[model samples]
Target: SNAIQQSDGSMIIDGSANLRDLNKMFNWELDTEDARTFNGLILEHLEEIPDEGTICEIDGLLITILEVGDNMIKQAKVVKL
Candidate 1:
């Protein structure tokens, strides 16, 4: 699947990336008690970077983790849509 992206009208995202980097990028500003929100997208993962079109949503937004898979690397991925 593609990398983390916003659903335009929902709360969710896709792809794989660095949790720490995302935290640093967002300055560790996690809206949800679990994930981080960014430019209308949720960023997560560690080994691989979310590819193509990942999605994200606001903390209060309601969404779900659609799916996740590998990337440039292998055995690393993220889920949400």
Candidate 2:
């Protein structure tokens, strides 16, 4: 699955979701050349693997790391602001 939309309008997205698809879905203007998937984008932005529960804000979205394993992001919660 790509994501689960919350009643509050936030989304819990799978890390493997394509960044370009997300950009189109949310009408965001994310740089897709730097990364292909959500996980890659986060890793590229932070320049390091983040621990679960870490939160980063980018492109008007609040992204909370939900799960991580083997140095890869597994899932994330995103809230558009």
Candidate 3:
């Protein structure tokens, strides 16, 4: 699955989802050479694995870390802004 849409208009995105695919899906320009997956993108930006509940903004979207395990991000909630 790509993303789960919430009633509030946010999306729960799988961390393993490809960044390029997401960009195309949302019609946004979320490009990066250093990361392939959403998890990798966030990690590259932070320079370290973030804990659950960490929030960051990128490309006009608010991304909240939803779950993490084994030093990898599992899920994130994205809200366009």
Candidate 4:
């Protein structure tokens, strides 16, 4: 469930749960198949939007969440430090 957007434009998600909730949906204990399925779903998302001009790879690492902002990803920096 998507929560209301904040004044800054970032919207809350999944009720009061944090990002950790979505991240943990991939937990091996709960369901390994789901985790693997989502892993591939991510790959499929990239495949659907193949690199034309908007996509690029980050050397030494598999690209992660391609933030889709206004039109495109405002930036593709590391998810977090």
TM-scores for all predictions: 0.27, 0.90, 0.90, 0.20
Question: On residues 1-81, what C-alpha lDDT tens digit does candidate 4 reach at each position?
Answer: 333444754333331222244356422121233223322333334545333234333322223333444333322322211
Using lDDT as the measure, name the better of candidate 3 and candidate 4: 3
TM-score of 2: 0.90
> Residue by residue across 1-81, what tens digits does model 3's lDDT show?
468999998999988989889888887667667789988887777877898999899777899999999898899999887
Residue 49 in model 2: shift from native, Å? 0.9
lDDT of model number 3: 0.85
The regions of model 2 sitting more than 4 angstroms off are none
- Name model 3 segments beyond 4 Å from true: none
Residue 24 error, candidate 1, Å: 1.1
- Minimum summed lDDT over a 10-residue window in model 2 is located at 25-34
Query: Which 10 consecutive positions of candidate 4 have the poorest summed lDDT?
Result: 72-81
Number of the candidate with higher TM-score, 1 or 3:
3
lDDT of each: 0.37, 0.87, 0.85, 0.33
